Amino acid sequence: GSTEKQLEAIDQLHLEYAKRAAPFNNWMESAMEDLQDMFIVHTIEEIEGLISAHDQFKSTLPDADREREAILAIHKEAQRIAESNHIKLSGSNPYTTVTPQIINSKWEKVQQLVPKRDHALLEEQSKQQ
């Protein structure tokens, strides 16, 4: 079995991985960035608006959550060949340098920052007016 074909057929799967992991890696980063940073508010409108940013987050989470699983759902086809045949992949991925753990643990980082911000938001908003 020519390795090139076993890589080529799953490289088109790497294609879909790179296509979906791309916005997801951007999303996780932007979210983690904002979630990491301590929010500063002046007026009450900003304190609620910041919470609205968590509102729409609580709705996107379950969707992007399944997205992470759907990304592994692409990798299962492209990885199973490497797990059965002694192929020679050039590292983790040719198009998108993301490992399953990197995307999963990044999600876990996003999730862990959710309550921290959700707590600070409500505490701050309750100390407002």
From Swiss-Prot:
It comes from Homo sapiens (Human). It comes from the Eukaryota. Widely expressed. The modification N6-acetyllysine is found at K76, K109. It is found in: Nucleus; Cytoplasm; Cell junction; Cytoplasm, Cytoskeleton, Stress fiber. Spectrin repeats lie at residues 12-123. It is linked to Focal segmental glomerulosclerosis 1: A renal pathology defined by the presence of segmental sclerosis in glomeruli and resulting in proteinuria, reduced glomerular filtration rate and progressive decline in renal function. Renal insufficiency often progresses to end-stage renal disease, a highly morbid state requiring either dialysis therapy or kidney transplantation. Contains one Leu-Xaa-Xaa-Leu-Leu (LXXLL) motif that mediates interaction with nuclear receptors. Homodimer; antiparallel. Binds TRIM3 at the N-terminus. Interacts with MICALL2 (preferentially in opened conformation); stimulated by RAB13 activation. Identified in a complex with CASK, IQGAP1, MAGI2, NPHS1, SPTAN1 and SPTBN1. Identified in a IGF2BP1-dependent mRNP granule complex containing untranslated mRNAs. Component of the CART complex, at least composed of ACTN4, HGS/HRS, MYO5B and TRIM3. Interacts with MAGI1. Interacts with PDLIM2. Interacts with PPARG and RARA. Binds to VCL; this interaction triggers VCL conformational changes. Interacts with SEPTIN14. Interacts with IGSF8. Belongs to the alpha-actinin family. This is Alpha-actinin-4. F-actin cross-linking protein which is thought to anchor actin to a variety of intracellular structures. This is a bundling protein. Probably involved in vesicular trafficking via its association with the CART complex. The CART complex is necessary for efficient transferrin receptor recycling but not for EGFR degradation. Involved in tight junction assembly in epithelial cells probably through interaction with MICALL2. Links MICALL2 to the actin cytoskeleton and recruits it to the tight junctions.
